[model samples]
Target: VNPTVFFDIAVDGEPLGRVSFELFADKVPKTAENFRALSTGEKGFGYKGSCFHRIIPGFMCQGGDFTRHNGTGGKSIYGEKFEDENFILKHTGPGILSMANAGPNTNGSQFFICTAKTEWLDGKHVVFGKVKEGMNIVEAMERFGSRNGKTSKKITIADCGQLE
Candidate 1:
């Protein structure tokens, strides 16, 4: 999935210029569609409630736990999007974004990007794409890793529209 439209997380709109993610619509079409639905408030996963659960340096930083992985409160989508899965996208090094899943097929929308090369996630998660240009932003988010692993501060996705 090629992301023509991306997002930046900020406090006031001044633009943090940090933590920007380019979604893959063409690579992982099903998950992308679910995310779009969630982002647009058309689905159930609370758009603003997601948080980073794991921040392993030289590895990856993860978010999207509807059940408090980030201390926020959300459940792992668990490859809910496997209903539409692509067995080819491989999850690799830094800025490599992928969906968190368990077992064989289960994913909702909880996505993550590797701060370092993560080869172990290859078969366990859906490695969709790499962060083409904003590794710094993701690095910053990784630095903000919650000791409790939650957004002690506010990390919100806000609302998004289709990129033109």
Candidate 2:
């Protein structure tokens, strides 16, 4: 079964909302588990307190860089980086959860949730999940984004974990 995970978001330290995701473990087991483990923080270093440092209004909001709290740093539980599991899933539409990598086989803890149909990223990025609920919160996040991937306000993942 696909595991459900959630992120309790905040804007500048104030509560925003939760964004739940249904990980595609069936298709992308390794990729999904990487995200799931990161959410649960079982590894002691995960996505908590991380900021969505890059926000592109018509594209996606990038985050999970707990190391630097910016788009420049983060590591996977496996190591500093991991291989691309597979591209079984497609970035067909919005709410698509995919790995954010520097290049091929450079996936770390960094991830992004698509707010638009980013079909161009299909084979380049490993799509592992999609938002199951609270997509409006992501929609609202668009207002704080810019074309240059900078945020007007700080968007943080205050908390995160698995949900049964």
Candidate 3:
């Protein structure tokens, strides 16, 4: 697996910037692999045109619902929900990338990038990766709130690829 993966995120159909993240492949192999596969288009699906769907400033920005375009849709690259890796990493600071799940062993394609430390989410979500660059752009994604339907400005993944 690549040590680093880079992706370009766009807001309202315009390129925002490139963002890189370090995958915890060794610690959480399955989770990392699912995210990598989804991000790199290895499974006939990727995050390229996915919408952020849910974004909460001072907290996190959630995305990766490639199927429904809402938070309720998405599945792992394996074509079904997978068990949580339950890695020991904590949500200690900003730019932390973790899987979003409905409950235990329900991990799928959905994920969130923390814009600030969220200690409460430590044990609930699997911390599979960490943002390595362009967090300011992540912060920018957090700038808007999607209370319903879609926000005034929709954030999308314009491009995604492996940095390694």
Candidate 4:
């Protein structure tokens, strides 16, 4: 079965809501395991306290940069970076979860949740999961997004963990 994970979010220290994800481990085991391990923090590092430093309305909300808490830093459990597992999944619609990378095979801990259909990213960014609940919270986050991919307020993953 696919593994589920969750992120308890906050904006500028105020509670936002929780966003749960269903990782497609059956299709992208390596990519999905990366996110699951990051959420559980079993490796001594993870997504907790990480901020969604980039948000673009109608595009996506990006986070998981636990190192810099910005867009510039993060490391995969495998290493500083890892290869694209595969493009078996497509960014077909909203709430899609995919790896965020600097270029090909540069995926680290950074990832994004789609707020709208983003087909252009297919085969480029590895799609490993999707939002299973609390999509409204993601839409609400769009309100703080700007054209420059910056958020008006600090949106953070206040907490995160695996869900059995």
**Deviation (Å) of 86 in candidate 4:** 0.7
By summed lDDT, the worst window of 10 consecutive residues in model 4 runs over 79-88
Over 1-164, each residue of candidate 2 has an lDDT whose tens digit, in order, gives: 79999999999899999999999999999899999999999988899888999999879999999998777899998876899999988998989999999999999999999999999998899999999999999998878999899899999999999998
Candidate 4 clash pair list? none
TM-score, model 3 to reference: 0.94
**Candidate 4 lDDT, 1-164, residue by residue in tens:** 99999999999999999989999999999999999999999999999989999999999999988898878999999976999889989999999999999999999999999999999999899999999999999999889999999799999999999987
The global C-alpha lDDT for each of the candidates, from Candidate 1 onward, is 0.58, 0.93, 0.86, 0.94
Give per-residue CA lDDT, model 3, range 11-126, as digits (tens): 88888888899999989889999888888887788787888898876778899999998898998987689998775899989999999999888998999999888999988999
Residue 54 shift from truth in candidate 1, angstroms: 2.7
Give the poorly placed runs of model 1, Cα more than 4 Å off: 10-15, 44-46, 66-84, 146-154, 158-161
For candidate 1, write residues 43-100 as lDDT tens digits.
4554554445566555677666645545334443343345437757665577777777
Better-scoring candidate (TM-score), 3 or 4? 4
Q: TM-scores for all candidates? A: 0.71, 0.98, 0.94, 0.98
Ranking by lDDT: 4, 2, 3, 1
TM-score of 4: 0.98
